[PDB]
Amino acid sequence: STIEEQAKTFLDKFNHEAEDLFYQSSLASWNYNTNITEENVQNMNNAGDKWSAFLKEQSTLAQMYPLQEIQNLTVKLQLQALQQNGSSVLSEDKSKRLNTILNTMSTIYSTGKVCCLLLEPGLNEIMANSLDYNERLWAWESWRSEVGKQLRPLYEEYVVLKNEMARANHYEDYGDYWRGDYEVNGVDGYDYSRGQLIEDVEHTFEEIKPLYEHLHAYVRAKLMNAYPSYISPIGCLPAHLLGDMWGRFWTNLYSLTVPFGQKPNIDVTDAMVDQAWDAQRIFKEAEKFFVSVGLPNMTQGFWENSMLTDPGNVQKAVCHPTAWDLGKGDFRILMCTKVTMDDFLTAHHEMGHIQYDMAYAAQPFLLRNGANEGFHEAVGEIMSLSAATPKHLKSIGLLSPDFQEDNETEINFLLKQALTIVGTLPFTYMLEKWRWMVFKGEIPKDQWMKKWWEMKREIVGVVEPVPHDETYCDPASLFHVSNDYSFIRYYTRTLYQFQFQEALCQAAKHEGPLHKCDISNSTEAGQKLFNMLRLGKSEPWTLALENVVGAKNMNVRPLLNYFEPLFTWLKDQNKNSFVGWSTDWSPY
Amino acid sequence: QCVNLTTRTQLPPAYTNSFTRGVYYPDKVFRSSVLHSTQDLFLPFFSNVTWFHAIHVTKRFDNPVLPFNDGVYFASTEKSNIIRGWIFGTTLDSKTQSLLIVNNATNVVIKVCEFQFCNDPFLGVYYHKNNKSWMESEFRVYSSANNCTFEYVSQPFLMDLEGKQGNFKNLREFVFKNIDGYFKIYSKHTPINLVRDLPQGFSALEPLVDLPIGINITRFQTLLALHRSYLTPGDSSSGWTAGAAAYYVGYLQPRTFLLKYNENGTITDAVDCALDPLSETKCTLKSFTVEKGIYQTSNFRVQPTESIVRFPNITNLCPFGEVFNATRFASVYAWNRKRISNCVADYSVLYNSASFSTFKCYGVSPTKLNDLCFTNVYADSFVIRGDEVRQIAPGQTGKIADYNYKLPDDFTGCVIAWNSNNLDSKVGGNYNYLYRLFRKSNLKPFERDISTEIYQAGSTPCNGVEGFNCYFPLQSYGFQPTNGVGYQPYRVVVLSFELLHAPATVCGPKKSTNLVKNKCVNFNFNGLTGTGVLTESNKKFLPFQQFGRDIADTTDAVRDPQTLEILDITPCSFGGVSVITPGTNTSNQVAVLYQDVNCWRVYSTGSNVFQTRAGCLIGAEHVNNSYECDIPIGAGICASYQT
Numbered sequence A: 001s002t003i004e005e006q007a008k009t010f011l012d013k014f015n016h017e018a019e020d021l022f023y024q025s026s027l028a029s030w031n032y033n034t035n036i037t038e039e040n041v042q043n044m045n046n047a048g049d050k051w052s053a054f055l056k057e058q059s060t061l062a063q064m065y066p067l068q069e070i071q072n073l074t075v076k077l078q079l080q081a082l083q084q085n086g087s088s089v090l091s092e093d094k095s096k097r098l099n100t101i102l103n104t105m106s107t108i109y110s111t112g113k114v115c116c117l118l119l120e121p122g123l124n125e126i127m128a129n130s131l132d133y134n135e136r137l138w139a140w141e142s143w144r145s146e147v148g149k150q151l152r153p154l155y156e157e158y159v160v161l162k163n164e165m166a167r168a169n170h171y172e173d174y175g176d177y178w179r180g181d182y183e184v185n186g187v188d189g190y191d192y193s194r195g196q197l198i199e200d201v202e203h204t205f206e207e208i209k210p211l212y213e214h215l216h217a218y219v220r221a222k223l224m225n226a227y228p229s230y231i232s233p234i235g236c237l238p239a240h241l242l243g244d245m246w247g248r249f250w251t252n253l254y255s256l257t258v259p260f261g262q263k264p265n266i267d268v269t270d271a272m273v274d275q276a277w278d279a280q281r282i283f284k285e286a287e288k289f290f291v292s293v294g295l296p297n298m299t300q301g302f303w304e305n306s307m308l309t310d311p312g313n314v315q316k317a318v319c320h321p322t323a324w325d326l327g328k329g330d331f332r333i334l335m336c337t338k339v340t341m342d343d344f345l346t347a348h349h350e351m352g353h354i355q356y357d358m359a360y361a362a363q364p365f366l367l368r369n370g371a372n373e374g375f376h377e378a379v380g381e382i383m384s385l386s387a388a389t390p391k392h393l394k395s396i397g398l399l400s401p402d403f404q405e406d407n408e409t410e411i412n413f414l415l416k417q418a419l420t421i422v423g424t425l426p427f428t429y430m431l432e433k434w435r436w437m438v439f440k441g442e443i444p445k446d447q448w449m450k451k452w453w454e455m456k457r458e459i460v461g462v463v464e465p466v467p468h469d470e471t472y473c474d475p476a477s478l479f480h481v482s483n484d485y486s487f488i489r490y491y492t493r494t495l496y497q498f499q500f501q502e503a504l505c506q507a508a509k510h511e512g513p514l515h516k517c518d519i520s521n522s523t524e525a526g527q528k529l530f531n532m533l534r535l536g537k538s539e540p541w542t543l544a545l546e547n548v549v550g551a552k553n554m555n556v557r558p559l560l561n562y563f564e565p566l567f568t569w570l571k572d573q574n575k576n577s578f579v580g581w582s583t584d585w586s587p588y
Numbered sequence B: 001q002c003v004n005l006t007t008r009t010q011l012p013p014a015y016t017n018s019f020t021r022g023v024y025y026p027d028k029v030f031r032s033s034v035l036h037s038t039q040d041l042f043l044p045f046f047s048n049v050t051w052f053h054a055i056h057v058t059k060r061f062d063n064p065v066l067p068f069n070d071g072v073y074f075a076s077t078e079k080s081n082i083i084r085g086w087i088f089g090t091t092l093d094s095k096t097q098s099l100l101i102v103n104n105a106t107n108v109v110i111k112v113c114e115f116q117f118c119n120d121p122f123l124g125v126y127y128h129k130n131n132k133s134w135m136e137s138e139f140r141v142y143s144s145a146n147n148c149t150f151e152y153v154s155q156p157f158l159m160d161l162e163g164k165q166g167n168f169k170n171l172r173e174f175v176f177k178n179i180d181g182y183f184k185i186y187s188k189h190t191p192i193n194l195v196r197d198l199p200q201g202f203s204a205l206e207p208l209v210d211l212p213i214g215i216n217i218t219r220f221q222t223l224l225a226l227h228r229s230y231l232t233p234g235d236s237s238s239g240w241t242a243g244a245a246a247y248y249v250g251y252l253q254p255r256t257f258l259l260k261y262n263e264n265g266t267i268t269d270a271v272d273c274a275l276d277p278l279s280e281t282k283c284t285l286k287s288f289t290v291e292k293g294i295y296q297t298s299n300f301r302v303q304p305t306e307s308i309v310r311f312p313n314i315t316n317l318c319p320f321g322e323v324f325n326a327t328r329f330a331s332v333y334a335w336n337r338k339r340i341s342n343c344v345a346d347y348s349v350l351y352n353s354a355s356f357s358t359f360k361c362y363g364v365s366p367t368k369l370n371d372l373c374f375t376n377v378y379a380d381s382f383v384i385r386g387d388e389v390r391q392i393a394p395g396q397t398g399k400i401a402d403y404n405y406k407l408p409d410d411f412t413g414c415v416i417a418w419n420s421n422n423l424d425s426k427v428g429g430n431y432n433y434l435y436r437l438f439r440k441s442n443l444k445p446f447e448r449d450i451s452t453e454i455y456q457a458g459s460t461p462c463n464g465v466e467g468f469n470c471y472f473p474l475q476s477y478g479f480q481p482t483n484g485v486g487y488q489p490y491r492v493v494v495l496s497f498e499l500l501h502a503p504a505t506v507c508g509p510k511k512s513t514n515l516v517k518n519k520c521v522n523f524n525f526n527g528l529t530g531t532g533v534l535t536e537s538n539k540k541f542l543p544f545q546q547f548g549r550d551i552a553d554t555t556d557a558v559r560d561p562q563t564l565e566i567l568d569i570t571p572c573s574f575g576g577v578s579v580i581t582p583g584t585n586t587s588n589q590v591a592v593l594y595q596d597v598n599c600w601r602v603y604s605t606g607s608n609v610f611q612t613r614a615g616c617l618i619g620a621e622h623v624n625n626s627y628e629c630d631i632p633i634g635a636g637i638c639a640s641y642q643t
């Protein structure tokens, strides 16, 4: 009969096979992640092979239904998410050359021999704490001269192959294929282009520039004292002094750039050690915070099946904090919890991922995901943003009751957050504008290094301590660049992280600035949030955003409001020093 | 030793009237500011009580043995503590067991033994002239008491025993009942100032004691006391005076009363609902005040008599242990059915097993089904996921209630479902339970299609092989132990109850009773309830029918379920009765209209019997004038309250 009615039947037949093969693969992956032994790798590969071959054949079947006749808009989305040819459109010969390139890049980055020192924790510890001008220059140049030198010829072939693969799938370039996640079509009034993402990414960064210029001049003016005569007040910060190998996070600069040194912060590790928290109470406190904001309880199987404490030396397991959703109503958390405030925060973060995965369990198989790629981490972060305010720790038994707070503490806190949040936005924006320019073809193959260090000085204000010719490949050192991952998810996660927080702090009727707003004991805010967690991917992300914040586009105004006291204090501190930088001064 | 009292003048017995006496609290629940109806054994209002004296002047030391029919109202007007107790029994001669309740000068003694009672039991008080004092000397009640089962002695007290000269000063009212091995006593004491008769007024008796004696009381006898002095000359059998006292005896009947509770919780007034038609309208309106008008009451009243329940004599338990504890439950797409017939089946234990996740019933109340009669019972048992249990209900939709198992809207059964993860899930998957996924059309209520037709989902002929657009319609559930609640295996049993014209076959449990005729009795045949006279019928029906119904569709001929006879039903009597009142505020006089009497099936004849086309009117004077209509009687006849 009609294509729409025959398609609804095909998808009814599909979801039933898919749910069971997916769960059979997730269980076999969990078994190896908790028991890192032999024979488990083979079951991991077999369960990941049957799923891949079944999905490949079912995707070949999906094509036979033309997509113009279907008008439901839901079956339209499932068939769109299924009919994508992916990389198979490339010929047989070049698909193994491309996968060989990918394998070689991952291998050449994972095993880097600097002599002999590897990366973790060989060069990372030197770069993060040496505080010697030349030792960290050797530890920087060595990596940029070995791992970046062995990846130069390969990335030139990776670019052209991925470009032809993206051109075959009706996109313009691989940059467009990446950009195509933030695309909504057919819903009148809510449409979004793939040319629209380049915009708004520029009219939001050109609106956050003043806070970054004042944070930069304060960091430079506080870094001039440590390294005596190597930094100049007009010039930019050399690249090896930014507290990280790639200068991605400025957090390690907080050991020097303390506004008020004497006052400490709210370290509550001793409070939990005193009361003998048994590495399980933390998750119960998280569950009670979620129960109080209004959402449903934890499923029973979570408590028995999940591994929440390292099994010891007899059983070894890789334990990077993770929340597992295995389908068929099965949820688990994998963490080696230890009694520290850091694990008290990560428990609420992972529990917010678990609470996001329970919401859309009613949706079909292909629509069980976040509205777009930058929504899971915003949800997981706002809960760890609210569960850190001193008022909340005061509500809980720890954090002894009186503890009056003063402003001199809130400036220390805000600057320790600003170095982490508003220091990585011009690096994410510059890196993801370089890769878009190189993929489009704007940067010829003879200007790859000459233009990177002209983006640096104009956007990030970071000069190089030794000039790099055309032969080098600096960006290929980063984990995301060489291993072929997207990077604009971290520019939108930060903005969504604070528009959610403003909207839900408003709905809780809190009065005062946002940096100490709490959400617990406010059922209305929880209902407001669950009204968008429930949709899953079935609705356009502009509609999913409008259900919480009230706008159809991403903004930067709430992020600026969060940092208003810090911005004023910095605007007063810098007046003796300079503001802004100059592109001419280079240390060499 | 026992002495037969002589020198007692014999007089004919005396009778008097009870003026709304003998009301007691029926239960032990506090109520306030309410009218409450209750059916129990009461002394009827304005009854005929017997009267007994102890008056010296004649002697007349009355102490007859009296019947104990269904319980006794005993009233005592005293000033000198003459009435001392009672003996209750059947033969009172040591062959059977008897109950003694006596108040001796010091204690209250309650004994249940085999007494050889004296022919003339009594107590003796002696008065000394030289020092003024009355003391108890004689206790002449029984010769021997051998096998004693129950005994009670109260704490010691000193009683007065002094002879008084005024009029009666104390009224003591008791009610005695004997039900299911318990002898129940209610009582109340009242101050009075009178000389003779049972006084007017109202006072409810309160529960006093409840003795577990377990004997067969049929008769009783009052125990009195004697006075002896120097002015009482003679031997033991003649030298005795009496001392004034009086007591009254009435007998209780099953009646319906409307009791009134004030705002403090005391019964201050009552209505006997079967005394008069006026009282019946009071009872119906549930008020003590009746406004002016004409009211329909009820047919000739024979009162409550006895209650019978008649059920089929079948004592075989139903296989409810085989459907629920079945070893192998069946796939949902090909479910099972078991018809349980000719069986007495208990559901309360099934209800309280408390192992069930969901137990819901439709068209049947959860507790009533314990005592009901159906023609057949079916049981459909299968297995589904936890989430789709919601679809097992009338008027639901989904992949289960469309292509697997469809229920009708008028469902008379009970859905039971309980998780069974432990039994029928295993590691790696339990892929045995298949369910239909694709079907051309929805399933009619209670129909099973277990075919494996290849679903031709499009336009091309499928030729009998699957592939593109030809789907096999049975898909298999995947159960594992680690799944969520929503994906875990629930076993479901759906009971269905069907009723036809055939003779009942699933009825129980409930014990039956005897069958009585020619009285107006309450009956329960196969779950049908009714109140009427059951009469033997020399008639027959066709083998497939059980009840007969008239033009109004009420049951007139109900076949007994044990012996398969036909028993006709006639209401208590067959009459038409109406009541005319000018208002209880104005007067208590009423008129009664009998709509089917030509003037005799009347409650009382009186005078002023007047015949109208509306019926026979009793209690109204007929005048030759013609006024405007005040109270409509009918057929042009009206009534009024005039001078």
Ligand SMILES: *[C@@H]1O[C@H](CO)[C@@H](O[C@@H]2O[C@H](CO)[C@@H](O)[C@H](O)[C@H]2NC(C)=O)[C@H](O)[C@H]1NC(C)=O
Pocket: A292, A391, A392, A394, A395, A396, A397, A518, A520, A521
């Ligand atoms: C949300 O409301 C609950 C009330 O149930 C608060 O819990 C109380 O917290 C105080 C602070 O230590 C305790 O002394 C009380 O015993 C807790 N229970 C009750 C019933 O008062 C909880 O603190 C509130 N949330 C916040 C953030 O204050």
Ligand SMILES: *[C@@H]1O[C@H](CO)[C@@H](O)[C@H](O)[C@H]1NC(C)=O
Pocket: A035, A037, A038, A315
């Ligand atoms: C881990 O794998 C080994 C390999 O056979 C097995 O013996 C052991 O039982 C596994 N661990 C657990 C907890 O089952």
Ligand SMILES: *[C@@H]1O[C@H](CO)[C@@H](O)[C@H](O)[C@H]1NC(C)=O
Pocket: A008, A072, A073, A074, A075
């Ligand atoms: C699309 O189909 C689903 C069922 O598969 C239905 O619930 C939904 O309403 C349909 N969409 C529209 C717009 O009707």
Ligand SMILES: *[C@@H]1O[C@H](CO)[C@@H](O)[C@H](O)[C@H]1NC(C)=O
Pocket: A063, A083, A084, A085, A089, A169, A170
């Ligand atoms: C995938 O390749 C097939 C091969 O002909 C083509 O018909 C189909 O349109 C391609 N899919 C897309 C989304 O272009």
Ligand SMILES: *[C@@H]1O[C@H](CO)[C@@H](O)[C@H](O)[C@H]1NC(C)=O
Pocket: A291, A297, A298
């Ligand atoms: C769900 O949470 C409420 C609120 O704390 C609690 O009372 C209830 O027992 C919980 N139930 C389960 C099954 O966890």
Ligand SMILES: *[C@@H]1O[C@H](CO)[C@@H](O)[C@H](O)[C@H]1NC(C)=O
Pocket: A407, A408
């Ligand atoms: C607030 O912070 C400033 C920053 O130096 C400090 O000078 C001041 O004393 C603090 N307290 C008040 C009340 O301003």
Ligand SMILES: *[C@@H]1O[C@H](CO)[C@@H](O)[C@H](O)[C@H]1NC(C)=O
Pocket: B320, B321, B324, B325, B353
């Ligand atoms: C079924 O088996 C259980 C367990 O032995 C038992 O308690 C129960 O009485 C049996 N019958 C029913 C109807 O549940």
Ligand SMILES: *[C@@H]1O[C@H](CO)[C@@H](O)[C@H](O)[C@H]1NC(C)=O
Pocket: B313, B562, B563
């Ligand atoms: C039981 O019922 C049958 C009905 O046919 C009857 O014949 C039989 O006498 C009854 N037995 C009794 C009442 O003991």
Ligand SMILES: [Zn+2]
Pocket: A349, A350, A353, A377, A380
């Ligand atoms: Zn996370």
